[PDB]
Structures are given as C-alpha cells and as structure tokens.
Design a protein around this ligand. Sequence first.
Ligand SMILES: [Zn+2]
Ligand SMILES: [Zn+2]
Ligand SMILES: [Zn+2]
Ligand SMILES: [Zn+2]
Lengths: 36, 36, 36
Amino acid sequence: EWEALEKKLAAAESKCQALEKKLQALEKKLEALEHG
Amino acid sequence: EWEALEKKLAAAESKCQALEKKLQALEKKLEALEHG
Amino acid sequence: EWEALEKKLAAAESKCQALEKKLQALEKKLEALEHG
Ligand SMILES: [Zn+2]
Ligand SMILES: [Zn+2]
Ligand SMILES: [Zn+2]
Ligand SMILES: [Zn+2]
C-alpha cells in the first residue's frame, strides 16, 4: 500500500543516517591508527 | 511510475543492508588492529 | 505528497551511493594498515 511505502522510505532514510554515523566513528578509530 | 518507485525503494533497502554488513566486516578488521 | 516521496527516494539513493564510496575509501586505508 501507499502508506506502507511512506513508512518504509522513512525507515530507510533513518537507517542510512545511522550508518553514516557508524562510518564516522570507524573513520575516527582508523585515523587514530593511521597517525599513531 | 508507481511500481517503479516500489522496486527502487526495495533495491535501496537491500543496498543499505549490504552496506551495513560491509561496515560490520570492516569494523571487525579495525578492531583486530586496534587491540593487536 | 507523491512528488515529495519521489524526490526523497532519489536523495536516499544518492546518499547511500556516497556512503558506499566513503566505505571503499576507508577500506583502502584499513588494508594499508592491515598489510603494512
Ligand atoms: Zn589519516
Ligand atoms: Zn543507505
Ligand atoms: Zn576497539
Ligand atoms: Zn587485508
């Protein structure tokens, strides 16, 4: 249905934003190793 | 069209789930370096 | 609205593709550490 598509998109947007944060945290740890 | 939007969302959900797995695998390698 | 859903999906697709690239760049740095 239409409303179910709405909510699926919103969930995918939120999951991608959580993955962006998780990658930023990994990048921080990697850079500590790379320069230390 | 409507059905093409349906299938695009499903593909984006699946691609994001593959990226979540890929990040988990990287995190595993990073943690090995970080503590070894 | 319908057209706003269209554009939101397209933005989410593009953001996920940018995250895929960012993860590939991190993987490259991690592999340099892992084998060097
Ligand atoms: Zn660096
Ligand atoms: Zn994503
Ligand atoms: Zn650790
Ligand atoms: Zn390796």
